[PDB]
């Protein structure tokens, strides 16, 4: 149902969401949607420092979310950590999601990708 793109977010879109984030942060109150949307762009970036910034923003969002939103935040924290080969963190997040949502086919596939990436690197966990 999809094609494999290499550039998942343009520099212009990353900057648009960065600008709104920094506007709100300087004005004192940041919308959850503004912070999440920026983080969501960051975690799709090609660059490691972007993905790390997105993980930071998602961890800050976690205590502000409804239980449904927290599940989405934890999923994207698993994705970002996976891409950075922060395997222990990626497993912690996705396995926590899989006990609170054992039917989640997306979480199960992400766990399989993490497992394969760890075995490729010769690691256990």
């Amino acid at each position: 149902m999809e094609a494999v793109l290499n550039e998942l977010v343009s520099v212009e879109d990353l900057l648009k969401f960065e600008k709104k984030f920094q506007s709100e942060k300087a004005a004192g109150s940041v919308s959850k949607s503004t912070q999440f949307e920026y983080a969501w762009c960051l975690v799709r970036s090609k660059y490691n420092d972007d993905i790390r910034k997105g993980i930071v923003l998602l961890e800050e969002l976690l205590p502000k979310g409804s239980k449904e939103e927290q599940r989405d935040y934890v999923f994207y924290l698993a994705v970002g950590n996976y891409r950075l080969k922060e395997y222990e963190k990626a497993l912690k997040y996705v396995r926590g999601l899989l006990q609170t949502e054992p039917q989640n086919n997306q979480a199960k596939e992400l766990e399989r990708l993490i497992d394969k990436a760890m075995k490729k690197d010769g690691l256990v966990g």
Binding site: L8, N48, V79, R83, K85, L110, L113
Partner: peptide, 11 residues
């Protein structure tokens, strides 16, 4: 260390 792993394709 260098490039991030690809964003998971099923997304």
């Amino acid at each position: 260390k260098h490039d991030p792993l690809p964003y998971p394709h099923f997304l």
